[PDB]
Symmetry: D2
Subunit: 115 residues, 4 copies
């Protein structure tokens, strides 16, 4: 599992469940091309997006549909979505966890990159 | 001043100075059109991006060039940029402050929205 | 203004207004002595807590009463308060801005430290 | 495991390893009394602080020695420590995860309370 996403809800103090997200890879076109997607689990996590062989160096975008999440809860949100854009880099074995902490008018994202 | 951006450096505990940022607005054909750009001052702020008359209803994207900021300080950061995407003014004009707090492998962004 | 506090509400996207906070300074016997207190304004800021002459070197604690803030808005939050503990002025006088960003089960705090 | 702590390093993008923390319980004295302590693991986590029987309702303080962590890395920090103060509340089965995200001049803490 070279790439995992974890989403937390700062209003309810809970995993953010059933959050849709899409992963894109930058093409030589300089355009965003679909790569993988899913919905977070009851633990707010999404595993199995890609494989070591598929997840080569390049620029990736993770788009988290925060707006639909807050709309489901009946809370007016600010952002259309949360986006995390980064270069995947081979430097020994690397696993990427993208963590996101959601509030209606604020979000934070952190990368935990381990070996 | 309907749109202002403030950027802070969480490593140094300081304004994030000379940070480039670009604002885009979604066009009717769903592409991102350039809207405004600038760089943060000594106070980490960018004022004067637009006017009440120009800042019409729409979907806007603020792209903050965090990578160049960290690189110039000797740091190889995680993110290519921080980008903030939001619908503006769809209930009438508002004043928007976009705040960003930067660390090499993390950032947070908050919006303060006020009624003039 | 050597010490200022700014508090934001991440649920509403607004200043956190009328937030009570108390500042303490560690005494020579390691107890927390009252130092200053006040409440945030309509802009979410609290100015005038102290002066350059009174704000001597020491270990300071800012206790922000986040629980009463959320409760008055109908929300039962996680934290009793947010507290910020730091050594001040031990390399000479500095100006400190303590920023807090509040959500019911989360908060963040950042310091902006500048040389007068 | 009714109470777990997880600490992340936003400068290095990694678990915050070997971070000392102390847990205190408020006494009727209105004073802070030692309850449990430990150091975060290589995954930035600290488990086994208490038990369901011991972790009764009351006010708890988690003090995270962020200053010593940053000093070990040679980075000047702002805070003496990070403190998380909360009331533990019986409302069906509840497990508490205190998560902390550390930067030298900034930290965030979030509570994930699950059933
Ligand atoms: Mg290479
Ligand atoms: Mg309309
Ligand atoms: Mg001295
Ligand atoms: Mg009860």
């Amino acid at each position: 599992c070279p790439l995992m996403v974890k989403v937390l809800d700062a209003v309810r103090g809970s995993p953010a469940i059933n959050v849709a997200l899409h992963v894109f890879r930058k093409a030589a076109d300089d355009t965003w091309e679909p790569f993988a997607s899913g919905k977070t689990s009851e633990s707010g996590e999404l595993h199995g997006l890609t494989t070591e062989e598929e997840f080569v160096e390049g620029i990736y975008k993770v788009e988290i549909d925060t707006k639909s999440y807050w709309k489901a809860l009946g809370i007016s949100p600010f952002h259309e979505h949360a986006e995390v854009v980064f270069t995947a880099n081979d430097s020994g074995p690397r696993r990427y966890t993208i963590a996101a902490l959601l509030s209606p008018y604020s979000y934070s994202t952190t990368a935990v990159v381990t070996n």
